Every structure is written in C-alpha cells, then in structure tokens.
Amino acid sequence: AYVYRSAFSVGLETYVTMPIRFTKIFYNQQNHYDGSTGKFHCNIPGLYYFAYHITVYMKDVKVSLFKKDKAMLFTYDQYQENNVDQASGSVLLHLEVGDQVWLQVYERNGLYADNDNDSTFTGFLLYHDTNPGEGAYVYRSAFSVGLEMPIRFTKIFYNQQNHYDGSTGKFHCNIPGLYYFAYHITVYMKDVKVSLFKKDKAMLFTYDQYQENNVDQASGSVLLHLEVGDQVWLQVYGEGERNGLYADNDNDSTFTGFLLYHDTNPYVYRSAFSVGLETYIPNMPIRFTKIFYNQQNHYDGSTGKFHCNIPGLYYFAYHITVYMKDVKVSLFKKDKAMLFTYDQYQENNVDQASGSVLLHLEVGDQVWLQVYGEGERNGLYADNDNDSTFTGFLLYHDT
Ligand SMILES: [Ca+2]
Ligand SMILES: [Ca+2]
Ligand SMILES: [Ca+2]
Ligand code: NA
C-alpha cells in the first residue's frame, strides 16, 4: 500500500519582524516546506492539519495563519513584564495542489526563540483526496470549527462529513476508532475553565487564569477511542462561571477532531498514546500515569518513556498547567533534548503551556518529556480536575 506523505515541522532560530521564516528543521523530508520563504506548498490535495506554538516574550504576539493569501486563523497573546507566555493554535484546512500556507504577525511581534526556547510550526496531510475512485479507500471523519451547555462553535473551517452538529456543539462518532481532539481558546475578561466530554462525562480539564490587561491562550489535546454513536464536546467547567472564552473578527477559539486510525478486525499501522499527570524529579522522565489511550503499550508508564516499535513519522503534543512556579520542559529523543518550552508563573495567574512537533523515529528510539536544566522550573500541575498531558501517534509508517 502506497503511503501519501507530505509534512513539515520547523522552528524559529531567530525572532524577527511578512511570512515568518522558520529555519530549524525538525522534519521536511518531502521538501514541501520552503525555508527561504517560510511557506508550505501543497503538492497533494487533501485535508491538512496545521499547529503552531509560540514563546511570548518582551512584547505582545498576534499571528495569523494564511492559506493562499487569506487570513484563516488568528491567535493573540498579551505579554506582561516578567511573565513569559505560551500561545498556540491549530486547525484543519482542505488544500488544493498549489495552495500555500504560512504564518505571519497579524506591532505584536513578541515571538521568541533562542538556544533553549522554541517557537514552532507544523502541518501534515491527514486525508488525501481519493481520485474517482482510485486505490486505497480513505476513512474520513473530521471537523474543525471556531467560536463566533456544550460550547456551540459555529464558524466552519471543516465539516465535510457533517459529523459535528453546529446547533448543539456535539461531534457524533459514525466510524469506530482512534480519534484526536484539540482545542485552543483565547482567554479574556474572565478565567477560562473547560472540559472535554465523552458521552456523559468529563475526560479532560483545562484552566487558565485571567489577569487584567493579560489576554492568554489555553489549549488541550487528547486521544480517545470512540464507538459508534458516542459523542464528544467542549463544555465550560466549574462553579464560578469560568467562561472567558473570546473571539471576534480577528481572534479565534477553536475545536478540532479527526479519526486517526479506524477499527479493523484481522492492515492499519497503529502506535499511539495519550497520558496525563496525576500530581507533580530532576533529570528523569516525567511519568504520566493517568491513561487516556495506550493500546499497543508503546508508552511505558513506569518510566514515562515512549518507545518506537514501528519506524516512521510521529507527531507529539503536550499541554501543561502552570501553577505556583515557572515551568520549563524539554522534549527528548534518544537522549537528546529536541524542543524546549518555557512558561513563567505570576502569582494568581495559572497558565497553559504547550508544544508539538513531528519526529521521524526508528527502532530503539525513545521519546519523553523532562523538566529543563537542573529541574527547578517544575511548576507542572495536575489533580482531579486540572490536566497536564502528553500525547503521541504514528502518522506515516516507512514503506
Ligand atoms: Ca506565563
Ligand atoms: Ca498572556
Ligand atoms: Ca493565565
Ligand atoms: Na498560554
């Protein structure tokens, strides 16, 4: 079976004030990301997932994701002195051969990256368009919606199967399998506390505190196996009306999901894990023990390490609640820290920090998350209704 690959994952090496030219190449094997322009070129029509994560320092940041010269998605994060922030966004977009996609500052150019600080930008082909009707059928169930009881997202980035109901805010599973979900909320005016529901219960929680003159960005993502007829949605969670979700002409709060691996009987290549902290050790892997998904057992709870058992391209994402103390983590691959994520903590201001990257892995490769340096910046937080999560999945197996 031919595998359709087109993916890139890059980072800033310099912060600069125009398309943002990422020049740190995590992955770009098809060479479909052009480093001299910062633009991704579509060579294969289909449904593409894009995600970015920016270190906010010194000055506010506002960026927009462009698809062939139109602003599709906006992400705003205000900076306060002595308070480094983390802003992210993600969305599905269907692309035609020729479409180009990039990121630029919507000044608010507070993007930052140096020798131990990353701002990254990643995209991959999820579903290629199935010529009429050639080769491998593709199982599709996906949605990507934005804000304009379940939270009713009405702005439609993608809903081609209509498995998401815009009048109720609910996604309905029509195809049994492993689903990925992600959200990104701009926090303004009031605190934001949300919860990802599955059927009838809160699976995941994300809290982000709002201080005056400090718009924030909060995100979450998880892997959930679904059976036909059960649904998923995002609901404001708490008892203090933590509903400071925001959106306007050029500010988004989004909710995205997609079938990753469909269920089969006796071939699909599956290697995935999604785990969370159940509370809060220097120079050692952070051990996430709450298990959302770990079907192949490729993630080892007892060591906190992911082991590659199928060579190919992997996507990793994490989301961390920042409380009481600065948080800085490094993503390791095979005893080398690949990616760094820093988020300062200010009193009475819980924060949300995240990163995600594509990494090609071979047999023996281990991936894990570790607190940075001497392990001092360990303000990671989790409890009965606050999450810090680590997720990874096999995207394309080597052929
Ligand atoms: Ca912060
Ligand atoms: Ca902020
Ligand atoms: Ca906050
Ligand atoms: Na944040």
Ligand at minimal distance from the CA of 217 is 4
Q: How far is the CA of 388 from the centre of ligand 3 (A)?
A: 15
Q: How far is the CA of 386 from the centre of ligand 3 (A)?
A: 14
Q: Residues near 234 by Cβ (< 8 Å), separated by ≥ 6?
A: 150, 151, 153, 169, 183, 194, 195, 196, 197, 255
User: Exposed (0-12), middle (13-18) or buried (19+): which is 182, by Cβ within 10 Å?
Assistant: buried
What is d(CA 349, CA 211) in angstroms, rounded to the nearest whole number?
Answer: 7
CB–CB of 219/319 below 8 Å? yes
Ligand at minimal distance from the CA of 213 is 2
For residue 203, how many other CB atoms are within 10 A of its CB?
16
Q: How far is the CA of 354 from the centre of ligand 3 (A)?
A: 13
Q: Residues near 319 by Cβ (< 8 Å), separated by ≥ 6?
A: 206, 219, 220, 221, 352, 353, 354, 387, 388, 389
- In this structure, is the dihedral angle defined by the CA atoms of residues 34, 332, 347 and 290, taken in order, positive or negative? positive
Judge if 131-267 and 267-399 fold alike in CATH terms. yes
CA neighbor of 69 nearest in space, from 98, 33, 35: 98
What is d(CA 127, CA 212) in angstroms, rounded to the nearest whole number?
Answer: 42
Residues in the chain: 399
Q: How far is the CA of 304 from the centre of ligand 2 (A)?
A: 30
Ligand at minimal distance from the CA of 350 is 3
Q: Residues near 252 by Cβ (< 8 Å), separated by ≥ 6?
A: 73, 74, 75, 89, 146, 147, 155, 184, 186
What is d(CA 92, CA 180) in angstroms, rounded to the nearest whole number?
Answer: 12
For residue 399, how many other CB atoms are within 10 A of its CB?
8
Helix, strand, coil share (%) of the chain residues, nearest 5: 0, 60, 40
Q: Is 348 left (phi over 0), alpha (psi -120 to 50) or beta?
A: left
Ligand at minimal distance from the CA of 61 is 2
Ligand at minimal distance from the CA of 211 is 3
Q: Which fold has domain 267-399?
A: Jelly Rolls (2.60.120)
Paired tokens of 23: 């020049």
Ligand at minimal distance from the CA of 88 is 4
CB–CB of 297/245 below 8 Å? no
Q: How far is the CA of 158 from the centre of ligand 1 (A)?
A: 31
- Find residue 205's DSSP bridge partners: 195
Q: After which residues, if any, is the chain broken (C to N > 2.5 Å)?
A: 17, 106, 148, 266, 280
DSSP state of 253: -
CB–CB of 101/42 below 8 Å? yes
Phi, psi dihedrals of residue 55, rounded to the nearest 5°? -80, 120
What is d(CA 167, CA 109) in angstroms, rounded to the nearest whole number?
Answer: 37
What is d(CA 179, CA 57) in angstroms, rounded to the nearest whole number?
Answer: 34
Instruction: State which H helix or E strand residue 105 sits in.
Output: strand 100-105
Q: How far is the CA of 321 from the centre of ligand 4 (A)?
A: 9
- Whole-angstrom CA distances from 29 to 6, 32, 258, 311, 396 are 8, 8, 24, 15, 12
What is the number of alpha carbons within 13 Å of residue 297 lying toward its C-beta? 1
Q: What is the dihedral of CA 76, 318, 393, 307, to 10 degrees?
A: 150
Q: How far is the CA of 228 from the centre of ligand 2 (A)?
A: 39
Identity of the amino acid at 183:
Y
Paired tokens of 232: 């998923």
CA neighbor of 273 nearest in space, from 320, 240, 306, 227: 306
Identify the three-state secondary structure at position 255.
strand
What's the chain's Rg over C-alpha atoms?
Answer: 19
For 273-305, the DSSP string reads EEEE-S---TTS-----EEEE-TT--EETTTTE
Q: Residues near 263 by Cβ (< 8 Å), separated by ≥ 6?
A: 176, 177
What is the number of alpha carbons within 13 Å of residue 138 lying toward its C-beta? 22
What is d(CA 78, CA 209) in angstroms, rounded to the nearest whole number?
Answer: 13
What is d(CA 32, CA 9) in angstroms, rounded to the nearest whole number?
Answer: 11
For 70-91, the DSSP string reads EEEEEEEE--BTTB-EEEEEEE
For 181-200, the DSSP string reads EEEEEEEEEEEEEEEEEETT
Resolution (A): 2.0
First to last CA, the chain: 8
CA neighbor of 119 nearest in space, from 22, 53, 200, 205: 53
Q: How far is the CA of 237 from the centre of ligand 2 (A)?
A: 21
Q: How far is the CA of 161 from the centre of ligand 4 (A)?
A: 32
CB–CB of 116/340 below 8 Å? yes
What is d(CA 254, CA 40) in angstroms, rounded to the nearest whole number?
Answer: 22
Ligand at minimal distance from the CA of 78 is 2
Q: How far is the CA of 85 from the centre of ligand 2 (A)?
A: 6
Q: Residues near 60 by Cβ (< 8 Å), separated by ≥ 6?
A: 76, 77, 78, 79, 108, 110
Paired tokens of 250: 């050029």
Paired tokens of 282: 């220097």
Q: Which fold has domain 131-267?
A: Jelly Rolls (2.60.120)
Instruction: State which H helix or E strand residue 342 sits in.
Output: strand 336-343
Domain extent listing, the chain: 1-130, 131-267, 267-399
DSSP state of 150: B
For 8-69, the DSSP string reads EEEE-SS----B----EEEE-TT--EETTTTEEE--S-EEEEEEEEEEEEEEEEEEEEEETT
- Residues lining ion ligand 2 (Cβ < 5 A) are 77-78, 85, 214, 216
Residue carrying structure tokens 């820093």: 342
List the Cα angle 271/274/280 in 5-degree steps. 140
CA 125 vs. chain centroid, Å, equals: 15
Identity of the amino acid at 191:
D
- Whole-angstrom CA distances from 391 to 10, 18, 182, 220, 350 are 19, 32, 11, 10, 22
DSSP state of 7: E
CB–CB of 125/393 below 8 Å? no
CB–CB of 176/227 below 8 Å? yes
Q: How far is the CA of 131 from the centre of ligand 2 (A)?
A: 45
What is d(CA 208, CA 193) in angstroms, rounded to the nearest whole number?
Answer: 6
Identify the three-state secondary structure at position 331.
strand
Evaluate the omega torsion of the peptide bond into residue 169 and state whether it is cis, within 30 degrees of 0.
no
Span 1-130: which CATH code?
2.60.120.40
